């Protein structure tokens, strides 16, 4: 799910950037260190809103490092997954263990046990697929997945998906 | 070796310590 979250960061600036345009460098650091990053506490951070209106407090010089620590408050759109949520995505990889669905910046794993009994794994077909008398699942196919669990690390997030329940599967 | 050189409590290898040193954005834009 996508949220507009008010986040704060502690940036460090090397002494080589102490000039009239120091604020510009801090904005670049925020755009290069925040955007595209994954944080378990808040989830993926996609975009930073109000680029011009970023508030920067006075920097503090570290004793033995010489760099300045800047606390930057900004508004950014984030994607934090949750178990029990229903999301849509496209299958990107397949194997005996299970196929993976691309939900935004996250990859959902559908284990062989979680998928219905009817689905069977066949690798003779190129590419490999999960086939059921009704439908067939393969790369680039759109699948509706239910997140059954999420493990959020400080710098990474992984989740598992299930299509056992009704109204979940090929779209 | 460096250019620079049940009760609650405040040996930890930590610190000039009386006063901190901050950077000034108002002055940086003016010096140049």
């Amino acid at each position: 799910m996508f949220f507009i979250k008010d986040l704060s960061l502690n940036i460090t600036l090397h002494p080589s950037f102490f000039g009239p345009r120091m604020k510009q460098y801090l904005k670049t650091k925020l755009l290069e260190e925040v955007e595209g990053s994954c944080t378990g506490k808040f989830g993926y951070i996609l975009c930073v809103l109000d680029y011009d209106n970023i508030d920067i407090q006075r920097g503090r010089i570290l004793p033995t490092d010489g760099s300045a620590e800047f606390n930057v408050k900004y508004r950014a759109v984030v994607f934090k997954p949750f178990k029990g949520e229903v999301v849509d995505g496209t299958v990107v990889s397949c194997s005996q263990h299970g196929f993976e669905v691309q939900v935004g910046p996250m990859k959902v794993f559908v284990t062989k046990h979680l998928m219905p009994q009817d689905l069977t794994f066949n690798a003779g077909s190129n590419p490999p697929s999960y086939q059921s008398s009704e439908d067939v699942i393969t790369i680039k196919s759109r699948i509706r997945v239910k997140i059954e669990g999420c493990i959020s690390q400080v710098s990474s997030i992984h989740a598992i998906g299930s299509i056992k329940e009704d109204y979940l599967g090929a779209i | 070796q460096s250019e620079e050189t049940a009760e609650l409590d405040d040996i930890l290898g930590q610190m000039t310590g009386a006063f901190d040193v901050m950077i000034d954005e108002e002055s940086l834009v003016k010096y140049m």
Binding site: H14, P15, S16, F18, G19, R58, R60, I61, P63, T64, G66 | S2, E3, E4, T5, T16, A18, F19, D20, V21, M22, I23, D24, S27, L28, Y31, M32
Partner: peptide, 28 residues
């Protein structure tokens, strides 16, 4: 600490024009 702070900053390839304020109340 300002003298050592700027000395380290200069040694780390910092431009030379001391834009620092002592956070005792902040004073420049």
């Amino acid at each position: 600490r300002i003298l050592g702070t700027r000395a380290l900053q200069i040694s780390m390839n910092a431009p030379v024009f001391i834009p620092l304020v002592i956070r005792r109340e902040d004073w420049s």
